[PDB]
Design a protein around this nucleic acid. Structure first.
Ligand SMILES: [Mg+2]
Ligand SMILES: [Mg+2]
Ligand SMILES: [Mg+2]
Ligand SMILES: [Mg+2]
Ligand SMILES: [Mg+2]
Ligand SMILES: [Mg+2]
Ligand SMILES: [Mg+2]
Ligand SMILES: [Mg+2]
Ligand SMILES: [Mg+2]
Ligand SMILES: [Mg+2]
Ligand SMILES: [Mg+2]
Ligand SMILES: [Mg+2]
Ligand SMILES: [Mg+2]
Ligand SMILES: [Mg+2]
Ligand SMILES: [Mg+2]
Ligand SMILES: [Mg+2]
Ligand SMILES: [Mg+2]
Ligand SMILES: [Mg+2]
Ligand SMILES: [Mg+2]
Ligand SMILES: [Mg+2]
Ligand SMILES: [Mg+2]
Ligand SMILES: [Mg+2]
Ligand SMILES: [Mg+2]
Ligand SMILES: [Mg+2]
Ligand SMILES: [Mg+2]
Ligand SMILES: [Mg+2]
Ligand SMILES: [Mg+2]
Ligand SMILES: [Mg+2]
Ligand SMILES: [Mg+2]
Lengths: 66, 181, 118, 25, 81
RNA sequence: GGCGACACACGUGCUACAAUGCCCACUACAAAGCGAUGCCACCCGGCAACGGGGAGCUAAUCGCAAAAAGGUGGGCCCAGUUCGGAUUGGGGUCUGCAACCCGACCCCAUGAAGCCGGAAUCGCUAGUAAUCGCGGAUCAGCCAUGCCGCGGUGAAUACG
RNA sequence: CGCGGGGUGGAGCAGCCCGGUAGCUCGUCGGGCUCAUAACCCGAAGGUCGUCGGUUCAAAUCCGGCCCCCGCAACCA
RNA sequence: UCGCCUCCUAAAAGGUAACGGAGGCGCCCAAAGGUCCCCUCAGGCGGGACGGAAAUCCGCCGGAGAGCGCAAGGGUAGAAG
């Protein structure tokens, strides 16, 4: 890497909906990540929260009782 | 730095899984991961190359390498384009610096994408490298959202010493690449 | 700071800035404010990064929002079309779906007028 | 204004009652 | 809507409930577009009437809460010029 | 089933484009008409529409009923916005044999065009024009923003 | 056959030289004024440049073929 | 039509005519020059946000069909690009 012209890329800390990624090793140490998926909310480590498909599921249910 | 968690993760627990699966007479035959090349094409900045060096500043920030600048191969009418002008930035990272970026990409960036039911699994290029592309740059940690004057995405290319997509798929899965299956 | 999807609101108010999120506003807003026991009159500019994650975690988890929400409404209508049903035709042809009158102004759902001769 | 059924004024206009124009006195 | 309700005309509701336990299923013309459809209507072919003629409609599980006159439209269009 | 069709074209209108304005809270002052096959106080349930219950009134005697703008207090801070609520998604209420075509209403989501309108063109001379609500007829219910009426506040300007 | 000019919205003409950009009048369409039509006023639509090739990054525009148009010539015999 | 360049005619040295068949020049470049160092195309297929037949990127195949200021020819990546 040519000497001049460069971000620092110095060891860091960092945060999320989870705890830390000690890994870091980036420019601009100590950053705040809004939420990740990995660390397993939101997709990975499937939460499947709020979950859909209820549209065929419902109309066949409220229907024949009424 | 030579430590870098993903690098580590690759050696203890990604390599051996891989050998168990395909099974490999040679230590070399088991896939390494070489070269993540990040390419921004910007027609966006065309007559204005002033906009450009702000975007280059941005790649550096998330890459830790300053990008070089691709200039136009031939001249083509329909969208402007003198054969002189700069089209985009392209930055090659390897070796540590690829790792320290791929980690960040896996554990921060891609999570922050609206929707994201996972990376497309057909983009393997048939000889076993993989490509994807991103719409916004603010999905990265080093970017503050107030430093974006305008959105520009990029093309990530990841080169792999695996001869096939199958193997290639395995490597990146095992590394923690979220896949839409 | 940012709530589900990207969607960063700011300054303004907290209860107001919440509307700017898709799937949310008015009622759903003043709801999650006392459900996290957060002051609505306050400005999203300043507030504890705690009551920020209090406030995000709730909303993002309570009801479905901009990404998966729009995807659902998209899928409802696709279902309504191609089933062959009459609600679905007026989606197919871009004409108003619930009653109303097409002899004169449907303009919102019809586009701008495209005139002809007499 | 008089057309938003989600307000007091809207409700009054249309002549209706609800969460935004409770019947109370 | 209805709810304490879910009205279906009994003209056909006979021949539907009948074509479940008979063992046979075939083509049935009705005028009742006011009625609701399913569950035991599914798989069955029903001919609704638009004011003009009886129209065949194949019945499936996502047609559930919908009245019969939805799948048999009342007008003719094909645009203008 | 259609009169409710929709590439379009015109008349009459309603709601707006906002800060003399929007929203929420509290607080006042009308008139005319309707209603015991109806109007429904009041208690409960419900966010609510509404539903249980359920008293009074053939009605200056009980009910529709809250008039609204206004007032006061606080909020929004000039932003396609706490403006504007058209379109659409899902959830329901009621009438009715029945609301797909075609009902009105409540709620959650959605929030479009619109930043005072080309040539042109209408009304109004005073308790009028603006603006604000209220009642009735028809009527099961309602597409009423219509129509016939009632009062609240209340200008401008006529040389000729 | 010869030399010169041309062919562009429905009509009539610019634009071609000098590559990047199609314009003007009338007509047509929608609205206004009028009892009504005309006139008049406010808006809009409408084209791939005879054609086939080639040149160039790019062709109504530059080059070639062909097809039409108009003009001039065809003398000593 | 008249001088100049390229190809054919031209009969495997040179040369060779016709109101024979076809094209071009009357410039251009202070870098499009000298040298030293490096680099290697066009095309096809596969992959990649806005990217489409074509902007940029990644992978494999690709001995020259590209490029060499402009016509053609000879030449040329073991460089002349
Ligand atoms: Mg593949
Ligand atoms: Mg490979
Ligand atoms: Mg209709
Ligand atoms: Mg409002
Ligand atoms: Mg009629
Ligand atoms: Mg009206
Ligand atoms: Mg606008
Ligand atoms: Mg209907
Ligand atoms: Mg404004
Ligand atoms: Mg006007
Ligand atoms: Mg008078
Ligand atoms: Mg009535
Ligand atoms: Mg009324
Ligand atoms: Mg012409
Ligand atoms: Mg006319
Ligand atoms: Mg006329
Ligand atoms: Mg020609
Ligand atoms: Mg061309
Ligand atoms: Mg002579
Ligand atoms: Mg030769
Ligand atoms: Mg010779
Ligand atoms: Mg010889
Ligand atoms: Mg040099
Ligand atoms: Mg190559
Ligand atoms: Mg290539
Ligand atoms: Mg490709
Ligand atoms: Mg060559
Ligand atoms: Mg040459
Ligand atoms: Mg050659």
């Amino acid at each position: 890497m040519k000497e001049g012209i460069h971000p620092k890329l110095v060891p860091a800390r960092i945060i999320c909906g989870c705890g830390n990624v000690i890994e870091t090793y980036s420019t601009k140490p100590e950053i705040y990540v809004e939420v990740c998926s990995k660390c397993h909310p939101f997709y990975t480590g499937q939460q499947r929260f709020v979950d859909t498909e209820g549209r065929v599921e419902r109309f066949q249910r409220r229907y024949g009782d009424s | 730095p030579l430590d870098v968690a993903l690098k580590r993760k690759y050696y203890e627990e990604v390599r051996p899984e891989l050998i168990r699966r395909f099974g490999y007479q040679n230590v070399w035959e088991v896939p390494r991961l070489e070269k993540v090349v990040i390419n921004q094409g910007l027609g966006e900045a065309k007559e204005d190359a002033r906009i450009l060096e702000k975007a280059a500043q941005e790649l550096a920030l998330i890459t830790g390498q300053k990008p070089a600048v691709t200039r136009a191969k031939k001249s083509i009418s329909n969208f402007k384009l003198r054969k002189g002008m700069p089209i985009g930035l392209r930055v090659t990272l390897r070796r540590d610096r690829m790792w320290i970026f791929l980690e960040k990409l896996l554990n921060v960036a891609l999570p922050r994408i609206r929707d994201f039911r996972g990376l497309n699994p057909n983009s393997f290029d048939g000889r076993g490298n993989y490509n994807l592309g991103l719409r916004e740059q603010l999905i990265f940690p080093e970017i503050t959202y107030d430093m974006v004057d305008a959105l520009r995405g990029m093309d990530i290319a990841v080169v792999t010493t695996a001869e096939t997509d199958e193997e290639a798929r395995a490597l990146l899965e095992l590394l923690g690449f979220p896949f839409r299956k | 700071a940012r709530i589900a999807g990207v969607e960063i609101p700011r300054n303004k108010r907290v209860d107001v800035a919440l509307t700017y999120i898709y799937g949310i506003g008015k009622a759903r807003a003043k709801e999650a404010l006392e459900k996290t026991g957060i002051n609505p009159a306050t400005r999203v500019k300043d507030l504890t990064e705690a009551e920020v994650v209090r406030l995000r975690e709730y909303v993002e988890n309570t009801w479905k929002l901009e990404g998966e929400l729009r995807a659902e409404v998209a899928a409802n209508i696709k279902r309504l079309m191609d089933i062959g049903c009459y609600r679905g035709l007026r989606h197919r042809r871009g004409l108003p779906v619930r009653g109303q009158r097409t002899r004169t102004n449907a303009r919102t759902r019809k586009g701008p007028r495209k005139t002809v001769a007499a | 204004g008089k057309g938003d059924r989600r307000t007091r004024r809207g409700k009054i206009w249309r002549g209706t009652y609800g969460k935004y124009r409770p019947r109370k006195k | 809507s209805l709810k304490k309700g879910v009205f279906v005309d009994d003209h056909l509701l006979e021949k539907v409930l009948e074509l479940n336990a008979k063992g046979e299923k075939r083509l049935i013309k009705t005028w009742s577009r006011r009625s609701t459809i399913v569950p035991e209507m599914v798989g069955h072919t029903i001919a609704v009437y638009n004011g003009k003629q009886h129209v065949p409609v194949y019945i499936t599980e996502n047609m559930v809460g919908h009245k019969l006159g939805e799948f048999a439209p009342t007008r003719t269009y094909r645009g203008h010029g």
